[PDB]
RNA sequence: CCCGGUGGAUGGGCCGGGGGUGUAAGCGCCGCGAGGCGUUGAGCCGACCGGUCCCAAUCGUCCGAGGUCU
RNA sequence: GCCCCAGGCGGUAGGGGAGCGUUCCCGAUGCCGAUGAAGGCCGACCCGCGAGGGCGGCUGGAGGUAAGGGAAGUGCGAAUGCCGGCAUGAGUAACGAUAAAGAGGGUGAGAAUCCCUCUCGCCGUAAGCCCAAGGGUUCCUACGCAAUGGUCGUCAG
RNA sequence: GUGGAGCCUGGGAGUGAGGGCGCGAGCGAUAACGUCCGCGUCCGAGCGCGGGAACAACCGAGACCGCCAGCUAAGGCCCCC
RNA sequence: GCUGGGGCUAGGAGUGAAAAGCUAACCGAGCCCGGAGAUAGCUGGUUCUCCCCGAAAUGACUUUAGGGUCAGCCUCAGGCG
RNA sequence: CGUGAGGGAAAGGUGAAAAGAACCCCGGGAGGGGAGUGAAAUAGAGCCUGAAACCGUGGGCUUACAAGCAGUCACGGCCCC
RNA sequence: AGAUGGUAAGGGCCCACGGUGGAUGCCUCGGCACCCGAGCCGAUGAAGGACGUGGCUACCUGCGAUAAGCCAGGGGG
């Protein structure tokens, strides 16, 4: 290992090019059937605290 | 009308929070609220506070219809980096740039 | 490992102290420059 | 290659995984519901189901078996008294795992509660 | 990539088989005792092979056709 | 005789000639300037062969300075140049011992990180206790969390 | 023979590592993109231009500038061209 | 033998069971300041425009051979023609 | 910073006047939006002007069979005046 | 049979607008140089300092336990 080093400065277009795939997918939400509030699917609605049409957590 | 709030001097990496803010550009206000509330990102919090704050400004100050509110345009200017030192191996020292960020949110009443 | 600065108040006084300088010609010269140069600390300070 | 190999390493060595299972189980029996990272939960389902199954069996040998892990007299008493009855007619599925909508702020980890079934 | 998504056996349980270890504990008896014998191929049992909806894949959301012209 | 005639016009080192621009002196107790100086940004407009100069638009808000001369710290891309910024590497490596953590409760806007309880692991010729040197208030308490703490941090040397 | 010819007198130089090609020689091995000389040229400084595919010195030819004009040089005239 | 504290030996000097080691993290001669803006025939750099002309890389001599003095070749001013 | 002798920084500018932003709202605060002072507030204290590097945000053209010291000439297309 | 423009994850150029930064312009409680004046202080304890002193005092200035000071004269109003 002889300390590899970046040969040249990365041009701006190339930098942004590598950052192309850096997008953040929006977190997909579904409305809580209890309180009509959006929240991640397959989780407890922290608003109503219900899940599977029944109560789970104490909001 | 366009409302606007700005988190001036937010101690956070600008490039990081830019990824968050670029996720709510052009969204309805409710949409952006929910998206912020469930986005696993530290910048998402600051974007949240600036977002709701912009909502208050659009309502109280500029008196816009909160229903038609959407993120017309938001972005993150970079702020004065706080230069600190990271003691590295063999005596030498680095200088980490603890970057500060300015957040700008801009709201309009989408019509139709 | 053991570095070169092993601080010791007595050593620092009887080595670089005011009276250490004043007892020798060259030391007196050093006091003179350090007066002309306007060093606030004319001698390395030490507690007691 | 983890082909067919069952169980999560959980980034802990062997005895630490085991003590994790024991402490997780202890808090679970002591509280019924607990909040923990998802993988710890799913790696805790079976380890609780087994203990509660011995609870359903209830005999002395099961007492010393479950006691080999829980290592408590009192908590095992509650196990063989409050839980063995209430699961006397349930075959498996002694625990439920629900994923919480809100990740842990400190690290972004996803949370989920494990609860004793009703 | 593949599979499953209540119509589900996809995974965890549990059950049954496999497989491994090798006669659990407790008790009884025999021993001064260490121990031995019977209960007992017992008990435990990770992946293995199937069954069982016990527990979980809830409810869901969003994209995505109006077909270029000679 | 300002124009025509003939010829010439690749160019380093280098020799010579001719101009442009910057600071400052005279012009100047002058002139321009709040109707906006300098300066900044912009122009596809005009002058010149060019160095550059006008002129225009917006910013700027208070100096600028002619013709014609003089005097220079006078013209920068390079000097592993100096100072200062901002980049690249890069959201990468790393986050500083593999002694190990988990759960409940509370606090609090905010909790993996703070306080409490319980459970677990580690040291135990110490990773425990006392003194000395050195350190110099870091000690206690209350408050606070801009920064520092390699994350957070409602905690804190 | 009037030429960016010549001479003289002064000021200022840089240069004093050259190279290739041709020819005449030495050395070399009648080897070297070798070395060393003489004559000459080009480059250097003409890595401006056409050709030689590409290529400093091989062939053509000395780039003041512009033109959406024409004639030729070497070299080409089957396509690239 | 190791170690604490108290002190002494220092720069062509000390010390050194001796390696040319160590002498405040680079010791075949410490560091700081000063001489000092040492010297550097060596390396690098040397900043606006336009125009005219336009080299050399040779000889001689050289403690000289990558540097120099003279001459060669450039330019400029004047004179001659 | 150096044991020390000694080396040795950076760092000026609101406004005429603090008139330095009451108060409301969002926010834990910060910060922000209003309001207000102000000739002016992109003069708001991180304050005259505020360049470039750099960074993003919107718009116009353009780009996923494509060869490149990034230019230059022509032609065309699009957009703007 | 055919031809074809088209999409932009992003990128590029240009324009507009921002942020960062602190060049530039202007200014100057500062400094440089030259000339003039003046030119020693100290055992009556100097230069230079430590530490203290304010009602509340971090620091600089002042001063010295009489401690941002005391006395007399002069200036001043
Ligand atoms: Zn709900």
Curated annotation (Swiss-Prot), chain A:
Pfam families: Ribosomal_L32p. It comes from the Bacteria. One of its GO terms (molecular function) is structural constituent of ribosome. InterPro entries: Ribosomal_bL32 (IPR002677), Ribosomal_bL32_bact (IPR044957), Ribosomal_zn-bd (IPR011332). The keyword Ribonucleoprotein applies. Residues 1-29 are annotated as: Disordered. Keywords: Ribonucleoprotein, Ribosomal protein. GO terms for cellular component: large ribosomal subunit. GO terms for biological process: translation. Residues 1-22 have a biased composition (Basic residues). The keyword Transferase does not apply. Part of the 50S ribosomal subunit. Belongs to the bacterial ribosomal protein bL32 family. Found on the solvent side of the large subunit. HAMAP family: Ribosomal_bL32. This is Large ribosomal subunit protein bL32. It comes from Thermus thermophilus (strain ATCC 27634 / DSM 579 / HB8).
Swiss-Prot record, chain B:
InterPro entries: Ribosomal_uL22, Ribosomal_uL22_bac/chlpt-type, Ribosomal_uL22_bac/org-type, Ribosomal_uL22_CS, Ribosomal_uL22_sf. GO terms for molecular function: rRNA binding; structural constituent of ribosome. The keyword S-adenosyl-L-methionine does not apply. One of its GO terms (biological process) is translation. GO terms for cellular component: cytosolic large ribosomal subunit. Keywords: Ribonucleoprotein, Ribosomal protein, RNA-binding, rRNA-binding. SUPFAM superfamilies: Ribosomal protein L22 (SSF54843). NCBIfam families: rplV_bact. Belongs to the universal ribosomal protein uL22 family. Part of the 50S ribosomal subunit. This protein binds specifically to 23S rRNA; its binding is stimulated by other ribosomal proteins, e.g. L4, L17, and L20. It is important during the early stages of 50S assembly. It makes multiple contacts with different domains of the 23S rRNA in the assembled 50S subunit and ribosome. HAMAP family: Ribosomal_uL22_B. This is Large ribosomal subunit protein uL22. The gene is rplV.
UniProtKB/Swiss-Prot annotation, chain C:
GO terms for molecular function: structural constituent of ribosome. Pfam families: Ribosomal_L34. GO terms for biological process: translation. The keyword Ribonucleoprotein applies. Gene3D superfamilies: 1.10.287.3980. One of its GO terms (cellular component) is ribonucleoprotein complex. It comes from the Bacteria. Residues 26-48 are annotated as: Disordered. Found on the solvent side of the large subunit. Belongs to the bacterial ribosomal protein bL34 family. Part of the 50S ribosomal subunit. The open reading frame (ORF) for this protein is entirely within the ORF for the RNase P protein (RnaP). The two start codons are separated by four nucleotides. This is Large ribosomal subunit protein bL34. It comes from Thermus thermophilus (strain ATCC 27634 / DSM 579 / HB8). The lineage of its organism: Bacteria, Thermotogati, Deinococcota, Deinococci, Thermales. The gene is rpmH.
From Swiss-Prot, chain D:
GO terms for cellular component: cytosolic large ribosomal subunit. The keyword Ribonucleoprotein applies. It comes from the Bacteria. Gene3D superfamilies: Ribosomal protein L17 (3.90.1030.10). GO terms for biological process: translation. InterPro entries: Ribosomal_bL17, Ribosomal_bL17_sf. SUPFAM superfamilies: Prokaryotic ribosomal protein L17. Pfam families: Ribosomal_L17. Signal peptide: none annotated. Keywords: Ribonucleoprotein, Ribosomal protein. One of its GO terms (molecular function) is structural constituent of ribosome. HAMAP family: Ribosomal_bL17. Part of the 50S ribosomal subunit. Contacts protein L32. Belongs to the bacterial ribosomal protein bL17 family. This is Large ribosomal subunit protein bL17.
């Amino acid at each position: 290992a002889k300390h590899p080093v970046p040969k040249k400065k990365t041009s701006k277009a190339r930098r942004d090019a590598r950052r192309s795939h850096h997008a953040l997918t929006p977190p997909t939400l579904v409305p809580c059937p209890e309180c009509k509030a959006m929240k991640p699917p397959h989780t407890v609605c922290p608003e109503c605290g219900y899940y599977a049409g029944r109560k789970v957590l104490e909001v | 009308m366009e409302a606007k709030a700005i988190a001036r001097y937010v101690r956070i990496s600008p490039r990081k929070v830019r990824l968050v803010v670029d996720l709510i550009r052009g969204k309805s206000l409710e949409e952006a609220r929910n998206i912020l509330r469930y986005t696993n990102k530290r910048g998402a919090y600051f974007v949240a506070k600036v977002l709701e704050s912009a909502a208050a400004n659009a309502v109280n100050n500029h008196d816009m219809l909160e229903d038609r509110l959407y993120v017309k345009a938001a972005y993150v200017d970079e702020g004065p980096a706080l230069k600190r030192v990271l003691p590295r191996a063999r005596g030498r020292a680095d200088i980490i740039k603890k970057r500060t960020s300015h957040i700008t949110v801009i709201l309009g009443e989408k019509h139709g | 490992m053991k570095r070169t600065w092993q601080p010791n108040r007595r050593k620092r006084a009887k080595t670089h102290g005011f009276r250490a300088r004043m007892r020798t010609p060259g030391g007196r010269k050093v006091l003179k420059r350090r007066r002309q140069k306007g060093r606030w600390r004319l001698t390395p300070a030490v507690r007691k | 290659m983890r082909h067919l190999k069952s169980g999560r390493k959980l980034n802990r060595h062997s005895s630490h995984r085991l003590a994790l299972y024991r402490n997780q189980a202890k808090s679970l029996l002591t509280h019924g519901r607990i909040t923990t990272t998802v993988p710890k939960a799913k790696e805790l389902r079976g380890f609780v189901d087994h203990l509660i199954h011995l609870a359903k069996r209830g005999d002395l040998h099961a007492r010393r078996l479950v006691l080999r892990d829980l290592q408590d007299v009192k908590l095992v008493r509650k196990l063989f008294d409050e839980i063995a009855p209430r699961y006397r007619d349930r075959q498996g599925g002694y625990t439920r795992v629900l994923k919480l909508a809100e990740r842990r702020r400190g690290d972004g980890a996803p949370l989920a509660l494990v609860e004793l079934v009703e």
